[PDB]
Structure 1
Amino acid sequence: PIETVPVKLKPGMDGPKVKQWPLTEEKIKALVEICTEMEKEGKISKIGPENPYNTPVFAIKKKDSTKWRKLVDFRELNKRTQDFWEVQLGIPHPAGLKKKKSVTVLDVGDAYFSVPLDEDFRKYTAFTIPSINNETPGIRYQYNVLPQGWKGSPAIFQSSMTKILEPFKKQNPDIVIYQYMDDLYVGSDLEIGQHRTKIEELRQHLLRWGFLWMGYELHPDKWTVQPIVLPEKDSWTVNDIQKLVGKLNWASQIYPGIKVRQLSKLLRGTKALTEVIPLTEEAELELAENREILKEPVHGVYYDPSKDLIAEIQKQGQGQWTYQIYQEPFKNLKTGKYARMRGAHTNDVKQLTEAVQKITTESIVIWGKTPKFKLPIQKETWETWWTEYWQATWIPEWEFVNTPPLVKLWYQ
């Protein structure tokens, strides 16, 4: 690939100037070793003081890997990089991916290092390996090839990727392959042992064309909007009915026809919260009619590719996290729950970071983009710790919730 694809920023925008956040000594050391080798291989080069730009960089460890890995936070550059229609007017996100029995994630970002980056655009990829205690100037590099995590990379490399895959896709017409950033998502409906073989045969095909040996197995069979469920009890306290009416009143913002009149009637008076209230026939029917309404899907819910996806997360305790993905309030496109997060029974922030990554992965598979997160955490705690548990080559956007939402109860 001698010819470079001309790339520009957006009109009236300069390159990114993001501060490098402080790094521990062991991450600095890992980055120095990694970048020295990248420099010997020509993938990056030292830059001078006439380059004022900067993108942050840190070091991680991929899922189940003891080797340090470099991750550049290109979020600023990506929003400043021109919108891309490299080959066509766009690739329709495959709606069949989310339907496959199994979906495997392959890291193919290593492919990007074979394509040179446009000489004029390289200065915008600048990044700094920081020193400790400002005791020396940071090490300043810029990329010479397509960098992992940059928006432009999959777009510029798409012509080459499609050709690499065509022979494989030619014989497996029922396997859906979709690329997001540095990852291929390969889904099928066939026996997990047979799917793993097809994935395995997809990998050795990549080797002959010029990897990583890592994978990720998903099952989008089961991603939906979880129903709103109401208690089934033989005796109801005043408190139980108050909780029910509150939950039903919340649901009535979502569902038409929810009624609470007959259930409220039961609470006629000023009763002790623990008093048992027998249900009347009127209230039983109303509850039954509400239950029926809640079985159907929410009316008029549709994905709009022009609007952002929003993901809210609630801490439920005991390692459980509920979340909803939506574009407009009360029009949930998907909801879910997580339990016993892996290797973090004692660390809230690790669990939240892992939930964010799992939710982003579901979002990529369903819609082909990442949601904007509303995180139940204080900014300073999140920004101090999230990079410690991040294992993905993309990074979504997030904002912080400081007032406890009453709706946490309704998703309990």
Structure 2
Amino acid sequence: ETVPVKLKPGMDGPKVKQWPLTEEKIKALVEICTEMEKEGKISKIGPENPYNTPVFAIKKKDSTKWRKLVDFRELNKRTQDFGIPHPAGLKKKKSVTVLDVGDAYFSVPLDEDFRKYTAFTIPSINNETPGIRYQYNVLPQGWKGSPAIFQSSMTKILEPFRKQNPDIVIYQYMDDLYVGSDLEIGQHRTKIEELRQHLLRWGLTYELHPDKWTVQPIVLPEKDSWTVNDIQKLVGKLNWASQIYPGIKVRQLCKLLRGTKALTEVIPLTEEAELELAENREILKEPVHGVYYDPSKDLIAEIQKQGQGQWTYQIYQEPFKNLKTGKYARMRGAHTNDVKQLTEAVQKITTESIVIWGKTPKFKLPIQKETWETWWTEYWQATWIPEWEFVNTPPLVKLWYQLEKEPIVGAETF
């Protein structure tokens, strides 16, 4: 049976435009939809319905098949409110595994009156054919009202695995389920299979390690001998940093820069000047005091391209008061594709974000809107989609965070 569902007060359904798709993705979506239509999950619609929501075809590993992905972001926002207080312990497991329980939704019908607002469009090449308009009859993956309306059903199906394995956390998010336990690499995976298998007898079918995540500090350089330029750069970095650690001081150091000498000229560090730097280093040995995650404010994720495939990002809600920060190195096979690295990094941060505060951050992307909107989808693999805005990276932010510390040698992964 269907529960009544409404939009928020005075909020009208989404009328978002469909981006063009490649032939292969259209062909795939058409196939995927003819079947859902056959299966009664969606139905074609008329011109009387003015609503529309973006759709595309993605394809995660272990697949020759395409997955259909509707961007219900706009709709989700307009969808009334109704979830769990998030398992604060999730961010502690030695290894968490993600599960796509998205199919466990077509089972449940969608309130008849809300159907219109799920209208989507399968585009046509060269506009040779008008779109194939549809709308859902069931709960659609990617919509926020789904995991909710299907909560209880998910509750009942999980318990049995939960009690047999109380040392394993089950947190849900959108079409996803995050399973984290401390069993060894093998004893852990065999457990997922048991949970999946259990999940398998219904209609549901990523391995991270939260306790490994460590917020690295900032490390100021320690040159053999310092040049005027060396100091000027250090002072700038340190001076900007003042905004985060008011105790950081550049007084003495800045006094060694009261000369119109060569940029390459080496300058002797006065004793006082070394104390100053020593203290700054101290101040920079730990995250600033007072940072508390507020669940009543938006989580903000900002990224900077450090070049060479490296990226840095900070998760925060208030300026300069970071909840988390990190460096991301591109994956094998992306040497020549900023967009791929970006979406990947964006997916990781989101994933990490989900694990920690159980919600996605609004992202600030160092990319042009046109460049992003044209290719992100080609490398997207997650079932959810975060919010984002495109921005110009400020020169110093990048200079300050590429400064973070890295492994002594690596991971020694034999």
Is TM-score (shorter-chain normalized) higher than 0.5?
Answer: yes
CA distance in 1: counterparts of 2:51 and 2:336, whole angstroms: 39
Secondary structure of 2:253's aligned partner: helix
Secondary structure of 1:22's aligned partner: coil
Task: Answer whether contact 2:95 2:182 (CA < 8 A) is retained.
Answer: yes
Task: Answer whether contact 1:16 1:77 (CA < 8 A) is retained.
Answer: yes
- The list of structure 1 runs, each at least 4 consecutive aligned residues, that deviate by more than 6 angstroms after superposition, is none
CA distance in 2: counterparts of 1:407 and 1:104, whole angstroms: 33
Task: Answer whether contact 1:101 1:188 (CA < 8 A) is retained.
Answer: yes
Secondary structure of 1:53's aligned partner: coil
Task: Answer whether contact 1:349 1:382 (CA < 8 A) is retained.
Answer: yes
1:246-303 C-alpha deviation (Å, 9 max, x unpaired)? 1111221111321111211222311111111121211111111111111122011011
Secondary structure of 2:69's aligned partner: strand
CA distance in 2: counterparts of 1:92 and 1:24, whole angstroms: 40
Task: Answer whether contact 1:225 1:332 (CA < 8 A) is retained.
Answer: no
Report how far residue 131 of structure 1 moved.
1.5
CA distance in 2: counterparts of 1:166 and 1:236, whole angstroms: 62
1:293-340 C-alpha deviation (Å, 9 max, x unpaired)? 111220110111111111111111111111111101100110011113
CA distance in 1: counterparts of 2:205 and 2:312, whole angstroms: 26
- Label 1:222 to 1:250 Cα distance change in 2 as closer, same or farther (>3 A): farther
CA distance in 2: counterparts of 1:261 and 1:406, whole angstroms: 19
1:324-371 C-alpha deviation (Å, 9 max, x unpaired)? 111011001100111132321111111111111111111111111111
Secondary structure of 2:43's aligned partner: strand
CA distance in 2: counterparts of 1:190 and 1:263, whole angstroms: 51
- Structure 1 stretch displaced more, 153-162 or 117-126: 117-126
- Label 1:8 to 1:358 Cα distance change in 2 as closer, same or farther (>3 A): same
- Structure 1 stretch displaced more, 58-67 or 236-245: 58-67
Report how far residue 225 of structure 1 moved.
3.1
CA distance in 1: counterparts of 2:248 and 2:275, whole angstroms: 12
Report how far residue 209 of structure 1 moved.
3.9
Report how far residue 167 of structure 1 moved.
0.5
Task: Answer whether contact 2:104 2:202 (CA < 8 A) is retained.
Answer: no
CA distance in 1: counterparts of 2:395 and 2:386, whole angstroms: 22
Secondary structure of 1:327's aligned partner: strand
1:106-155 C-alpha deviation (Å, 9 max, x unpaired)? 11101111111111111111101111222222111111111000000000
Structure 1 partner of 2:74: 76
Structure 2 partner of 1:321: 311
Report how far residue 232 of structure 1 moved.
1.5
Report how far residue 64 of structure 1 moved.
4.0
1:226-257 C-alpha deviation (Å, 9 max, x unpaired)? 21111112211111111111111122111132
Task: Answer whether contact 2:314 2:322 (CA < 8 A) is retained.
Answer: yes
Matched, 1:383 2:383: no
CA distance in 1: counterparts of 2:268 and 2:53, whole angstroms: 64
> Which structure 1 residue ranges, 5 or more long, are not aligned?
85-89
CA distance in 2: counterparts of 1:335 and 1:325, whole angstroms: 6
CA distance in 1: counterparts of 2:360 and 2:266, whole angstroms: 47
> Which structure 2 residue ranges, 5 or more long, are not aligned?
403-414
Report how far residue 406 of structure 1 moved.
2.4
Report how far residue 174 of structure 1 moved.
1.4
Q: TM-score, normalised by structure 1?
A: 0.95
Root-mean-square deviation (CA, aligned residues, Å) is 1.4
Matched, 1:230 2:220: yes
Task: Answer whether contact 2:94 2:212 (CA < 8 A) is retained.
Answer: no
Report how far residue 50 of structure 1 moved.
1.8
Report how far residue 403 of structure 1 moved.
5.7
Task: Answer whether contact 2:304 2:393 (CA < 8 A) is retained.
Answer: no
Task: Answer whether contact 2:303 2:365 (CA < 8 A) is retained.
Answer: yes
Structure 2 partner of 1:87: none
- Structure 1 stretch displaced more, 294-303 or 149-158: 294-303
Task: Answer whether contact 1:310 1:373 (CA < 8 A) is retained.
Answer: yes
Report how far residue 404 of structure 1 moved.
4.2
- Label 1:403 to 1:172 Cα distance change in 2 as closer, same or farther (>3 A): closer
Task: Answer whether contact 2:14 2:74 (CA < 8 A) is retained.
Answer: yes
CA distance in 2: counterparts of 1:30 and 1:159, whole angstroms: 33
- Structure 1 stretch displaced more, 318-327 or 200-209: 200-209
Structure 1 partner of 2:98: 105
